[PDB]
Subunit: 295 residues, 4 copies
Amino acid sequence: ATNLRGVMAALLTPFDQQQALDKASLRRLVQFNIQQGIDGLYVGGSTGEAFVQSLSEREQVLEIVAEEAKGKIKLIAHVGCVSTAESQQLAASAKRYGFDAVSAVTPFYYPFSFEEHCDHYRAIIDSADGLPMVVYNIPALSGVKLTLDQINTLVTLPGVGALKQTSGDLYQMEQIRREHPDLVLYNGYDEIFASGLLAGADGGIGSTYNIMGWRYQGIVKALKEGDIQTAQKLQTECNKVIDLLIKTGVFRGLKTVLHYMDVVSVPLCRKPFGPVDEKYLPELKALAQQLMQER
Amino acid sequence: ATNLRGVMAALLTPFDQQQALDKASLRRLVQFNIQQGIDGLYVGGSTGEAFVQSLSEREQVLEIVAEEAKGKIKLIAHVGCVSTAESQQLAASAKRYGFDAVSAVTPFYYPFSFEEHCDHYRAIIDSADGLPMVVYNIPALSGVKLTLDQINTLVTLPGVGALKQTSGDLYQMEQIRREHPDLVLYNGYDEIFASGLLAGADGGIGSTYNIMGWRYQGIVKALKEGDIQTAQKLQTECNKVIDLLIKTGVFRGLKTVLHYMDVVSVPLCRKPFGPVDEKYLPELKALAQQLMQERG
Amino acid sequence: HHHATNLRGVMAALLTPFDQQQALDKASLRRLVQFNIQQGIDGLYVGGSTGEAFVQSLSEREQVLEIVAEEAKGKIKLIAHVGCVSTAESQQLAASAKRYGFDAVSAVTPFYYPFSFEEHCDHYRAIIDSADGLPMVVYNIPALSGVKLTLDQINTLVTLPGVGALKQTSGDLYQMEQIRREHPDLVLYNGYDEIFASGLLAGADGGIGSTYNIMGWRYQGIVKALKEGDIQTAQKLQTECNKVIDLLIKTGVFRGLKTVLHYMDVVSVPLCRKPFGPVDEKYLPELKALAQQLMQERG
Amino acid sequence: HHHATNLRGVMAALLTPFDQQQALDKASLRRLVQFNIQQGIDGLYVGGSTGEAFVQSLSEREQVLEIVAEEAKGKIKLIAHVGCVSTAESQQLAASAKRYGFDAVSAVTPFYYPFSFEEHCDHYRAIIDSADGLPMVVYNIPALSGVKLTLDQINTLVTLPGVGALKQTSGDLYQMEQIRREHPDLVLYNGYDEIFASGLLAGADGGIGSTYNIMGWRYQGIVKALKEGDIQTAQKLQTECNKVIDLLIKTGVFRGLKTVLHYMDVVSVPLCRKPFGPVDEKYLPELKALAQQLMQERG
Ligand SMILES: [Cl-]
Ligand SMILES: [Cl-]
Ligand SMILES: [Cl-]
Ligand SMILES: [Cl-]
């Protein structure tokens, strides 16, 4: 799955004032990401507010993104739901729309065993019908640090093409790379991107790529050139942003920056997310202006 | 909300081998719980496998349980989703079908503030159109211990009529009762029911009540009569069963017991839940036979 | 386990009074032992966490053990908490407990460094050997130790030869019941004072607690009320205990207790050792009012 | 922070050799000090967790401090970990560190009892006063201590008067970067050896680690490779360190390290103190083979 290697934005879902999909802003956001030189888009993930959308709504996003982006950048459909059948429906739809890959978060909420996770992934792969699968290692959600044997099991499942390493454990990052030298291994926490690459990730998937994807592409290139100072500098700038976004609320802060970038019409998330606290708007607008100047 | 007090079974949702809703087994389960002398049913909760069902399916179940049980026992609809809008849709449906109350788990997965949980409950309460609301204190999911002040804010939200205390912290159970003398306070962990009552809970909502609700009613009665020994003995028997169900998988183990009690046609949970390991079937069948004899 | 039957009951986890220079206040320590004997406490648990053992040297701990033995041997049951991280240090305290005439030893699961479960077992075996006949109380406090024993592991620990009891300092009352179910004759001490009534109901047959220093009689009252089937009295007593515990959590538990004991004319100077700070002066009125209230309910 | 810049670098967290009877092996201690110096290490961190401080008496820890200072003062930097639960005990060790001529002191956040943040700050202030001019290395540590500091709390700790450095025993490299961003001149030691390269990239300017005892030159290699922009050499070296760390985690880290040193003819007897058990015999060939491989990397 070498063709899945790279820096992929986890696409946000713009909503209108009534919390319905803002189709026009979705299309603007897809093109905005393409123009940033991003390798691909990760669509319908946690970042896309998948877990406050219906299946129909998730499919509509997939279809529109494919319309805008197919044959220009890589497209990975996050089809994960708690339910295997629901996840399967989305995988089949991803295949129809011509996505390059599917992905599923570890089924959550209820206590599922590792065996049940594996069967879940097998069924989704079947429904994906030739599309490779990106599986997760996400301890914050699962409540489990899986062993290296379990990871081997996961990443050697027939059809699995990559691992989204959504963990800040860079010893485990290095251990996974050592065990699987050819594995596509996405760094999941944007705020350790540079260090995650050094530890052995060969790319990433992240929410903040939407507004500053060129910075992350800059880190990749700097590290390839042995330019440690440039890499560090860029990560420091990314982290200044992540500091602010955690204060504001990450998705809504991102949408607001995009609103000031003239991409997103209405920067709301779906309830129960509240609006951005108005005291942060000047910082978010200033950030949008700073980012716009970096282009 | 005092009429919401008591022992409420968290109803399981029967499915068939296609993973479709088994409507005949659902009606049978509802009647079986009524015949156990249960005070009510808590429908479409986590226990009811809500989070692997669509809104429509949850509505179908709510409507059918209301058909079978409205007027005979108390009915609480769990309408909780991550999405407020979705929760409001189910709240409005619960009202239409004639439920006595609604309930919603803390919105999960994403990081939401306590203020955002409160606005979420307010929106659901509005859509429930006069039905009282049961809120949760569920640290295992929320990943936080709520201050007494936060609980105090929660239970005094307008329209909130009970707290589902899904915590094994019996110091906090007492603190809550001490602060809110008239609060309807449901013990959430079946395996500490007797001790939870002793600490201040005045009832419970439980998945295991589906197969042995009379034992939990028996603990209420024994504690009211000052019969500590019978209370302890019954809790011990419930915990022998809980030990087994934790090994088998709780929901599928319960459905399997009900299958052996001739209530549920097919004891499956929805994928990604797998089947019960067949080595446990003799124990589960033997347990069904023991429970049937207790009635007898 | 049946041979350990005489260890069943309500045991105060003794505090260690210090003077203004943070040295042992022997006169106050002797006072506190006698105060606890006069409350009709079944026994004393000496040199535990409550005693500030982990800010004491070995010699200081032996000194406390020897003094308490001088005051109380033969009058009430005495359990010596001998636990340190080091097994050799623990053994030295265990031998001393035997020399001074203690009825039992106890050890917290060795902490800080991750030790294997087999290493915990050998630690307990070594201490049991040095205790030379005195039975062992296994002391379980996941919240402070950071040691997370499984039920299987607990079952193995409590059946080690020479083990006569379990100090269960856990709020998990499902586990409490599971332990009782597996070991019908085991002496099973409830460790969190704020759930005492519920813990007894779940299957503890007594408790070891720091708050017993100032209101042991309330906890004995709960044991009696449950045994008689008087659930109302049991609940009411537990509620009063929890009102006190609410205050103590605000003030800091050890120092709040010593302050109450100061106002009861037991403890001269209610200091804990650094880095414990002093009680906030705004809480003194509440602490004095509690001392007065508690002195009243004895008649 | 700028005036304690000379503590920047790669500092081995010194192990404490014990003899067959588990008493201090002074001879082997002197030999381990010289072994570390000959590796080109910048300094030693003495009497930390790694040095088995928490299974030693105060006198034993002082004896170790005196011996190391004898062997190494003036040749490399020396940091005395003086941390105990007790402030007065930490102050004794701090006064001794000053007497033996150490360059800095350090103290783990006091553990077991749940101290407030203000209490932690006063504990450090008191130790800083007793160290009488030696700068303090503070801790940010949860996995071992159990103490869970916020970033704002870390920022207050590291700016206390007399604090010259932070030992960041955390795998959180976002926080590592945040700390560097807030404090440009702070000496910031990477605490987890297994992420050393990544930790330097995030902002650490050196480290303190147990595995430096057997392969310190590899970590100095990483520093140098990263300074020269040779990312592949850095990754390669970190990968080799991690293969060793994988084995040490299987064997038990301190005892595994001691066994490697025994095979390198640095340490006479590779025992840790009870309740640490011995290395399982089945790992000995791997440990001997590791010793030979490391001896070859410099011979
Ligand atoms: Cl995502
Ligand atoms: Cl439920
Ligand atoms: Cl104690
Ligand atoms: Cl150390």
